[PDB]
């Protein structure tokens, strides 16, 4: 955004600076250099804006955009969830073998050097705490939702 409005080029010949600042409210936003290449500030000026929000509109767009209907009251493909519970763990073994590798070449060349040098091949340590978040929220959400169906549905 940043709407603009012209300034007279008559005052440019006079060398006179317009708009006679009486409040510390105008010079808050800094103009971009690419707009400063153009006619700002020799032919037009910026104007600070805000937005008119109101509760007549605010609530009726928040509570209506992303509402999940009955998704978490499901079981998520019950033969395949435990199948996917091995589709991660199997390569998580070998990704821990890398974690059984990368720790072993420490007390070595000053691990700031182990920051530059590890941009070619994958590391365990970040990738290994990755799947643990995946292998938890996929399990804890699915195990809990199974045990609320047993009470509510008879």
């Amino acid at each position: 955004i940043d709407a603009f409005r012209l300034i007279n080029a008559n005052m440019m010949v006079l060398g006179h600076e317009p708009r006679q600042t009486t409040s510390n409210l105008g010079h808050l936003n800094k103009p971009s250099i690419q707009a400063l290449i153009h006619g700002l500030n020799r032919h037009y000026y910026s104007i600070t804006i805000n937005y008119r929000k109101n509760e007549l509109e605010q609530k009726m767009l928040l509570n209506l955009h992303k509402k999940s209907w009955m998704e978490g009251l499901t079981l998520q493909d019950y033969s395949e969830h435990c199948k996917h519970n091995e589709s991660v763990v199997k390569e998580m073994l070998e990704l821990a073998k890398n974690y059984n590798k990368a720790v072993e070449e420490e007390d070595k060349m000053t691990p700031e050097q182990l920051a530059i040098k590890n941009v070619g091949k994958q590391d365990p340590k970040r990738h290994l705490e990755e799947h643990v978040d995946v292998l938890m929220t996929s399990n804890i959400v699915q195990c809990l939702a199974a045990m609320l169906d047993t009470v509510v549905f008879k």
């Binding site: 009955m70 009251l73 079981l75 019950y78 033969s79 169906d149 549905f153």
Partner: protein
């Protein structure tokens, strides 16, 4: 008989084919080695049964299907009742 029965005796089925019990066993031999009809017959108690696997995972799997059929059904009537009140007590 595989479609609608669960467990039938050997003597009963051979009577509904009007032939020998040995000839009945020869019929089910060359059809499940064709595996076009699955069966697990017996020749000590004569107890054959149709479509009877172990079912390790299909219990909860078919149960979870019955939820989604049910939860689609409680949503079917829910938005249907509110319009039915709108044609009796409108204005």
């Amino acid at each position: 008989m595989a479609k609608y029965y669960t467990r039938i005796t050997m003597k009963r089925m051979a009577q509904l084919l009007d032939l020998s019990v040995d000839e009945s066993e020869a019929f089910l031999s060359n059809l499940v080695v064709n595996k076009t009809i699955f069966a697990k017959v017996d020749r000590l108690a004569g107890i054959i049964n149709f479509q009877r696997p172990k079912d390790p995972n299909n219990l909860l799997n078919d149960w979870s299907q019955k939820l989604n059929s049910l939860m689609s059904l409680v949503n079917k009537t829910t938005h249907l009742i509110a319009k039915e009140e709108m044609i009796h007590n409108l204005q």
